[PDB]
Amino acid sequence: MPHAFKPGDLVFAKMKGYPHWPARIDDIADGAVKPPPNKYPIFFFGTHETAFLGPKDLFPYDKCKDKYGKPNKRKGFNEGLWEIQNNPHASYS
Numbered sequence: 366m367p368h369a370f371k372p373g374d375l376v377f378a379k380m381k382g383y384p385h386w387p388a389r390i391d392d393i394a395d396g397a398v399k400p401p402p403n404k405y406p407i408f409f410f411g412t413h414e415t416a417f418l419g420p421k422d423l424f425p426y427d428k429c430k431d432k433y434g435k436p437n438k439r440k441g442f443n444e445g446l447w448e449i450q451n452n453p454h455a456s457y458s
């Protein structure tokens with residue numbers, strides 16, 4: 366039964382103008398910028414960009430991969446598909 370989102374959870378994250386994108390709930394490093402209240406730091410695979418999102422835009426990866434996990438022409442998307450499937454918890458800095 367679902368819990369709240371926690372660092373390390375794998376998701377598809379929805380941003381305006383982008384398809385649902387392979388992503389993870391990031392950790393917040395010591396001394397790093399914290400997200401606004403009720404928002405999570407979302408690390409987008411492939412592009413390696415971060416955005417702050419609420420749960421309305423976060424879809425669990427295992428439940429939605431058959432819907433959202435197909436190749437896409439957008440820059441970084443297919444690289445992101447490889448990352449979320451093959452090394453989702455690695456450091457991509």
Ligand SMILES: Brc1c[nH]nc1-c1ccncc1
Binds near residue numbers: 386410414415416441
């Ligand atoms: Br959606 C997506 C995939 N990679 N990066 C993004 C993104 C776009 C804009 N602001 C933050 C993150």
